[PDB]
Amino acid sequence: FENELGAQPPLGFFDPLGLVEDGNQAKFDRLRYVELKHGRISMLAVVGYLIEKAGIRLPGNISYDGTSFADIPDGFAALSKIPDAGLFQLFAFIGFLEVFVMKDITGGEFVGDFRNGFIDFGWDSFDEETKLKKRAIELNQGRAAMMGILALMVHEKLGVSL
Amino acid sequence: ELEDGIGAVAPLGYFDPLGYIKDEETFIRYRAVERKHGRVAMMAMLGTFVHNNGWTFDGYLSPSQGLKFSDIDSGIGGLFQVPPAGLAQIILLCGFVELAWWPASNLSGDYGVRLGTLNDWEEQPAKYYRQKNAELNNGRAAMMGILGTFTHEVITGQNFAEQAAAGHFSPFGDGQGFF
Amino acid sequence: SEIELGATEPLGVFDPLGWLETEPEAFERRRAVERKHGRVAMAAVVGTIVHNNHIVFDGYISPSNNLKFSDIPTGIDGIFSVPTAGLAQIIAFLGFVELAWLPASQYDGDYGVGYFGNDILDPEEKARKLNAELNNGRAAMMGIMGNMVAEKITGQTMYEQYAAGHFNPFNDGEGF
Amino acid sequence: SEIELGVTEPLGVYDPLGWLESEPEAFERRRAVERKHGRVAMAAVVGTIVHNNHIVFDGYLSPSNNLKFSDIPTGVDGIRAIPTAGLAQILAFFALVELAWMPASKYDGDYGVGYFGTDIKDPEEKARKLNVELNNGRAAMMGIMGNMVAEVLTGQTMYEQYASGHISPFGDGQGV
Amino acid sequence: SEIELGVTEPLGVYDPLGWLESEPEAFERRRAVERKHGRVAMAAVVGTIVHNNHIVFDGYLSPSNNLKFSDIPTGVDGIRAIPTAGLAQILAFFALVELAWMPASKYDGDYGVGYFGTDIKDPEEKARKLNVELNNGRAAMMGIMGNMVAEVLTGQTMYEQYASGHISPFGD
Amino acid sequence: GASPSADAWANSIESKALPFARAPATLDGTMLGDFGFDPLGFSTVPVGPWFTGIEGRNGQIGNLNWYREAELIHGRIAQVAVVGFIAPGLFGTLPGNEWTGVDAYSNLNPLEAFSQVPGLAILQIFLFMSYLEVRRINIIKEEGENYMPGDLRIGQGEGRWNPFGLDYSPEAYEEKRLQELKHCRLAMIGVFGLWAQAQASGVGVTEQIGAALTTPDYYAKAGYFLP
Ligand code: CLA
Ligand code: CLA
Ligand SMILES: CCCCCCCCCCCCCCCC(=O)OC[C@H](CO[C@@H]1O[C@H](CS(=O)(=O)O)[C@@H](O)[C@H](O)[C@H]1O)OC(=O)CCCCCCCCCCCCCCC
Ligand SMILES: CC(=O)O[C@H]1CC(C)(C)C(=C=C/C(C)=C/C=C/C(C)=C/C=C/C=C(C)/C=C/C=C(\C)C(=O)C[C@@]23O[C@]2(C)C[C@@H](O)CC3(C)C)[C@](C)(O)C1
Ligand code: KC1
Ligand code: KC1
Numbered sequence A: 001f002e003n004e005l006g007a008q009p010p011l012g013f014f015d016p017l018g019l020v021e022d023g024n025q026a027k028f029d030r031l032r033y034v035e036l037k038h039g040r041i042s043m044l045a046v047v048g049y050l051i052e053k054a055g056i057r058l059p060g061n062i063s064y065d066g067t068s069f070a071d072i073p074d075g076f077a078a079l080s081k082i083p084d085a086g087l088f089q090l091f092a093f094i095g096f097l098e099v100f101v102m103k104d105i106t107g108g109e110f111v112g113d114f115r116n117g118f119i120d121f122g123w124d125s126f127d128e129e130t131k132l133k134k135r136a137i138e139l140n141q142g143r144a145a146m147m148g149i150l151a152l153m154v155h156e157k158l159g160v161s162l
Numbered sequence B: 001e002l003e004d005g006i007g008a009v010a011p012l013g014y015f016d017p018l019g020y021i022k023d024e025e026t027f028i029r030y031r032a033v034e035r036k037h038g039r040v041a042m043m044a045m046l047g048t049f050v051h052n053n054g055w056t057f058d059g060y061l062s063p064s065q066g067l068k069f070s071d072i073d074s075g076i077g078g079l080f081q082v083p084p085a086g087l088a089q090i091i092l093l094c095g096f097v098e099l100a101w102w103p104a105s106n107l108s109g110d111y112g113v114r115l116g117t118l119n120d121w122e123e124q125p126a127k128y129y130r131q132k133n134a135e136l137n138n139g140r141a142a143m144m145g146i147l148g149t150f151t152h153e154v155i156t157g158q159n160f161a162e163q164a165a166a167g168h169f170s171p172f173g174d175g176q177g178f179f
Numbered sequence C: 001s002e003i004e005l006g007a008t009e010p011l012g013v014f015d016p017l018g019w020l021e022t023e024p025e026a027f028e029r030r031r032a033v034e035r036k037h038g039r040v041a042m043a044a045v046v047g048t049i050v051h052n053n054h055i056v057f058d059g060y061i062s063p064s065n066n067l068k069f070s071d072i073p074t075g076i077d078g079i080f081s082v083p084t085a086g087l088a089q090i091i092a093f094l095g096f097v098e099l100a101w102l103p104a105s106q107y108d109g110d111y112g113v114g115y116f117g118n119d120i121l122d123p124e125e126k127a128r129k130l131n132a133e134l135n136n137g138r139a140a141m142m143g144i145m146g147n148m149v150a151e152k153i154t155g156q157t158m159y160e161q162y163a164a165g166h167f168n169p170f171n172d173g174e175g176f
Numbered sequence D: 001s002e003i004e005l006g007v008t009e010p011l012g013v014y015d016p017l018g019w020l021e022s023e024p025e026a027f028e029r030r031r032a033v034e035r036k037h038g039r040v041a042m043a044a045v046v047g048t049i050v051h052n053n054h055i056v057f058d059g060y061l062s063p064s065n066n067l068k069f070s071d072i073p074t075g076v077d078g079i080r081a082i083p084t085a086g087l088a089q090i091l092a093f094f095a096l097v098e099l100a101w102m103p104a105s106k107y108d109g110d111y112g113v114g115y116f117g118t119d120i121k122d123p124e125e126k127a128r129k130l131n132v133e134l135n136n137g138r139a140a141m142m143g144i145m146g147n148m149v150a151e152v153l154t155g156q157t158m159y160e161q162y163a164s165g166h167i168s169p170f171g172d173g174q175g176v
Numbered sequence E: 001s002e003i004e005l006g007v008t009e010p011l012g013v014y015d016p017l018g019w020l021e022s023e024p025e026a027f028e029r030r031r032a033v034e035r036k037h038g039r040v041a042m043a044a045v046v047g048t049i050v051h052n053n054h055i056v057f058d059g060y061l062s063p064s065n066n067l068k069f070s071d072i073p074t075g076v077d078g079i080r081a082i083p084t085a086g087l088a089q090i091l092a093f094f095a096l097v098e099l100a101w102m103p104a105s106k107y108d109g110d111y112g113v114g115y116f117g118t119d120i121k122d123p124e125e126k127a128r129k130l131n132v133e134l135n136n137g138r139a140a141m142m143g144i145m146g147n148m149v150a151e152v153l154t155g156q157t158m159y160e161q162y163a164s165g166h167i168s169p170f171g172d
Numbered sequence F: 001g002a003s004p005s006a007d008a009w010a011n012s013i014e015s016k017a018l019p020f021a022r023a024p025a026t027l028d029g030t031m032l033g034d035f036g037f038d039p040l041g042f043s044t045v046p047v048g049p050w051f052t053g054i055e056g057r058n059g060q061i062g063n064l065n066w067y068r069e070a071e072l073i074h075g076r077i078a079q080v081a082v083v084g085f086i087a088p089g090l091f092g093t094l095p096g097n098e099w100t101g102v103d104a105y106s107n108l109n110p111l112e113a114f115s116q117v118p119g120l121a122i123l124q125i126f127l128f129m130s131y132l133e134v135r136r137i138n139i140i141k142e143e144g145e146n147y148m149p150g151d152l153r154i155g156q157g158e159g160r161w162n163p164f165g166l167d168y169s170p171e172a173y174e175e176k177r178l179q180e181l182k183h184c185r186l187a188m189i190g191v192f193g194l195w196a197q198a199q200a201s202g203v204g205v206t207e208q209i210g211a212a213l214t215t216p217d218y219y220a221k222a223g224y225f226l227p
């Protein structure tokens, strides 16, 4: 596991702990799957935190109930003031994504390739050099975003300005 | 039947420990009795389960004697609570089954009672051996249970609802027997 | 056979620790443990619905102790509120069932009784209900565990919690 | 060797029962029992001297029972005054010592230590101190039993017997 | 004779990670660290016993800080009560022992002192005592963690906890 | 035609325990402790290790190793339960907290002491009884047909647990097996009488024997008033 997507000009195949010092491909492609699973969530979570800290909201009225978007606080307190009828809808639809439409249904050519032949914004117009660094970008962009988003939440509960 | 091994179930096998089967013709007589006694004593055990639970019919068993269903004892004396004009009806119907409909002279015990898809013995013969052994085994356990139910009322004087209300499940320290 | 059942459509043969390729000699006992843990949890999940719906029998489970059946709590403390002479009668009978009647050293789980008595005549209608026992058994393992940890964390039983409407863990008083 | 280790000058080989050739195979456990009984009784004699000199630990043996160390009788009722949770600690520690650390089934008593951590390399000097351990063990075995029967026949501890001037036998004594 | 110095009864050779032939190269350091961690922890559980029995040095540790020996806490926070001008004095002196006098570079653990100044020349005499130093060192490592963990999970020191009768695990 | 056990009552050798009753042929003499005592003919109908599954439910012909396995485990428990019926009444009881409740371990009637001690006391005893029965089944899994009855691998011979040496001679070992079996059969009768007297008297056995081995308070002479 010397030369693939995590191998890296500052730190090539870091691996400090006792994870993959064997030839088990199935151990690696499970761990590679979750690393971009955590990265793709945390990339939207860095942006999803900093639009709430900047105070940007949807144009109002999250419910017919008389609660607007600006009434809902930012950070961990957003979870407590979202109406519970709508907080089921967030967990049910993300569950609807994570069960049904988020998958290697048809078989991609790598791990995390969830194009089932349904949606594709190109991926043919690359020169086979640019494909594997452009998903080495989103591995490392997803790498820094999950240490980014973990910093935003350890310091919200601490109260430290960032 | 001996060759299928109908009564011989897996804890004890061919449990004839005192040596009573000395040929094949006296097994068919004994199995005809054991299966018949087991069928009677199974309905006798479901009786004592229902009687001692207080589940009675509503109304009068004998309105000309004024005897309600509620004032029949749930114990060993409850059958003879019943007027003899009434249980002559029980003996005459049960005697008519024993001679005409399910003739107890039939030593095979088959009377054609088939409840079809719950016993499709022709396509699952293992279900035949399961239901044939369980008719004997539930009949043997209920034969000893009704001998249990009978003598527990005799030696204590209380029926099963009364000796379970008192917690009287030990023949030691009570005023009954020499123990 | 047995090594391909337990593997249904959304994941296939699912073993992230890889003990099928690594230790195949331990699989048929581990299937027997999975099937037994399933069948125990299925009666355990069904029991929690029946207890918390206040379906009780009547009278006293222990008249010496003056302890009714409705005096039993409907949560985790219910089997431990039963007196010790009563719990010893359960475990002695359940050990009679798990060693003599349905001996759990028999690892194919097959004890003479079929599916409602019948042997499944088809081989893959048999494999479909063999997978449905495993999948409902695996779902009930998470169901009884998800009912035990969520009682001891929220402090209330399943009737108590549902009466109170304590369903949202984000706007109550809890951790996070 | 072990057969030569118990013999000293005024008696030599001393067995009135004659079991040294009647039961020559039972000797090597019977030496280990004599050495164990001697080692136990030597600490018991020194213990009774310490208890009756009123050397106490300055504290509370069980503050739960308001039991000071000086409230414990210095005679044969000493460990009858120890609370039962206290004798459980003594029996649990010496289960670890008499079965695992210095196991009493090791029939030579040669566990890890020497004489103050020294292996006596001289065989005539090592046999001399092995004779001393047996002889001081034999003297303390008679010493602890004559201490114990003198307490129960006087009703006094060894401090009270030397307080009242009760060395002279009211019963009948036997001592050197 | 160092690969059989930790082998004793019931466990025998104990290696759940299997490092004894995963790394047969790094055993000489890893034994010397286990021996050093054992010697440090053995002088630490004895330290917690002396401190919680209120054996103090009947004077002033820092008369500049107006601080006497009985004012220092007898728990985990006793090293923090020492002023930094005084704890600099102990890392200045143990720099002299750990680099110069008995250098921890020396992976034998063997220096000019023996077992109370004596060299043990019978070879399982000596291997019995070397096993004891390791085993009492291992038991003191688990002993000094179990003292420091159980202090902070009750907040009391060992003197305070035993006086309150807080031995049985009630809250945990 | 005939029963497999009616053929064992046809040979029907002389007995020793019931010397008027002609013990059946399945008591071959080759077993430890066989004294020709089987009036109900259980040895003619031998049982197999049913706990191992359905393939072990059948019993082999002429093999009483599982009857002897149940005889030894009933008697080994019964032996240590004589002392359990006696030693709280002799050597006192154990003290209790406020957690377990005081006088929880102090019921000298041994039968309601089951219902007085905490449930965690009974559960940890049952789990320790469970652990050696897990050790038993794992021995009968491995040994199978060469499994000796009563073997928990404790003692003298092959790779068994022997922390005491216990290195008997090969026919003083069969006397220890006979001493164990005769104490097994005796203490089974003894622990039945203890269980039946504790119900019939309501107290422990030291508390019933000690009351019967004492003079009554109205019969006791005043005694020793002569100066
Ligand atoms: C209605 C009474 C009755 C009859 C006629 C039979 C007949 C038979 N049994 Mg069954 N059995 C019965 C009741 C009966 N059983 C009960 C109640 C039990 C549970 C204890 C059993 C348990 C049992 C097993 C496990 C097996 C049999 C088997 C057999 C067959 C073997 C021969 C034999 O042992 O005869 C029995 C001898 C007689 C009936 C004549 C003697 C009559 C005595 C002296 C009367 C005295 C009884 C006394 C008053 C009360 C007894 C109960 C008491 C101990 C408390 C034979 C067909 C075997 C079999 O089917 O193999 C294929 C077999 O394996 N029996
Ligand atoms: C703890 C008990 C005990 C045991 C097991 C032994 C065992 C032995 N002794 Mg030792 N001995 C003991 C206590 C014991 N001794 C005490 C207290 C004294 C001082 C009086 C001696 C004085 C002594 C001498 C001078 C010698 C021995 C020798 C021996 C060995 C000879 C083998 C033999 O045939 O002895 C006979 C068997 C026995 C001694 C064990 C039988 C135990 C008896 C039957 C118990 C009954 C005692 C009775 C109740 C005491 C009541 C009075 C008391 C309370 C005051 C044997 C290892 C000899 C030796 O070592 O040569 C190699 C030897 O020369 N013994
Ligand atoms: C081929 C044709 C076949 C036909 C078959 C038809 C059979 C019909 C079913 C027969 C069922 C069996 C009936 C048993 C009799 C019974 O129930 O007694 C009824 C009474 C009920 O009393 C009760 O006692 C009660 C007192 S108390 O309330 O419980 O305190 C009280 O409530 C109650 O009123 C009172 O009645 O019970 C007793 O008297 C106990 C009797 C003890 C056993 C009797 C032995 C019978 C003799 C045979 C001995 C062996 C013979 C060989 C030697 C020669
Ligand atoms: C604390 C306390 O006291 O407890 C409280 C707790 C709590 C939780 C608050 C309570 C509550 C309220 C609850 C739980 C309410 C839940 C109600 C529930 C469960 C409502 C089901 C609707 C499904 C429908 C209508 C299906 C349409 C289905 C249609 C139209 C189909 O065609 C289905 C289909 O399959 C077929 C038939 C035919 C197929 O060809 C096609 C498909 C496959 C599509 C209580 C009662 O207050 C008690
Ligand atoms: C063989 C026949 C039989 C008798 C005669 C009998 C009698 C009693 N049963 Mg038992 N019992 C079974 C069989 C029998 N029981 C079976 C097959 C099971 C299923 C496993 C079972 C389960 C429980 C539980 C959970 C409890 C229990 C009790 C009592 C107690 C009530 C009086 C009282 O307690 O005052 C009396 C003596 C309670 C108890 O022991 O309370 C201390 C209690 O909690 N039973
Ligand atoms: C060579 C001889 C020598 C002198 C002459 C000397 C003198 C002082 N020692 Mg030092 N000392 C050692 C040697 C010497 N010390 C050694 C071998 C060790 C162990 C490695 C050691 C350890 C500590 C600790 C823990 C503390 C300490 C202190 C003082 C302070 C007291 C006066 C005061 O403080 O008013 C005066 C200057 C305390 C302190 O510095 O408090 C600010 C303090 O806490 N010392």
Ligand code: KC1
Pocket: B061, B062, B063, B064, B065, B082, B083, B085, B086, B087, B089, B090, B091, B093, B094
């Ligand atoms: C064919 C239709 C039919 C009629 C018309 C009829 C009529 C009466 N039956 Mg009924 N009967 C059956 C059928 C019929 N019976 C059947 C199939 C059985 C099961 C074998 C049966 C059983 C009993 C028992 C146990 C008793 C009983 C009684 C009466 C009595 C009520 C008034 C009265 O008190 O006289 C009137 C005459 C009681 C009794 O005779 O009391 C002296 C009584 O105890 N019967």
